[PDB]
From Swiss-Prot, chain B:
May perform an important processing step in the conversion of high energy nucleotides prior to uptake by the parasite. NTPAse-II has a specific activity 4.5-fold lower than NTPAse-I in hydrolysis of ATP. The primary difference between these isozymes lies in their ability to hydrolyze nucleoside triphosphate versus diphosphate substrates. While NTPAse-II hydrolyzes ATP to ADP and ADP to AMP at almost the same rate, NTPAse-I hydrolyzes ADP to AMP at a much slower rate (0.7% of the rate for ATP). This is Nucleoside-triphosphatase 2. It comes from the Eukaryota. The lineage of its organism: Eukaryota, Sar, Alveolata, Apicomplexa, Conoidasida. The chain holds residues 382 to 483 of 628 of the full protein. Transmembrane segments: none annotated. It comes from Toxoplasma gondii. Glycans are attached at residue 51. It is found in: Secreted; Parasitophorous vacuole.
Amino acid sequence: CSIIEGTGNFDKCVSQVESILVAPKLPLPANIEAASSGFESVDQVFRFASS
Amino acid sequence: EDVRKNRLKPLATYCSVHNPEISFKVTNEMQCRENSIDPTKPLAERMKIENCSIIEGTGNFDKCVSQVESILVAPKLPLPANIEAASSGFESVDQVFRFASS
């Protein structure tokens, strides 16, 4: 990769943030503190605990 | 033959795809699969030792040590339901003395 080009597609930007940062396959590195409390990712927070 | 009076029952009940700790957490699913337990398959199939009818004793102690070592003491992934140990910084029994000694 040499250059990053902006496409400005918001719907594709949401779906990517979702799969990469919000709900990934494995938890994001150095998150053992979150995993110990019972949450691997951001999506798991509201699926297990709601208020 | 009693399913409850079987030593695998708590591990096979935990290692279930219907348990939110496996269906949502891939790390825990891989831990179960490493111990041959398939969480997708039914409970009877989970506790079942596939293609095995009789267990024969060979009495080899050195071979018995190397197996307990690779299976229970120092496995590839941590043994299922050990998030409490992993949080303190220990995946397995071998890691205890490699990180902390007294």
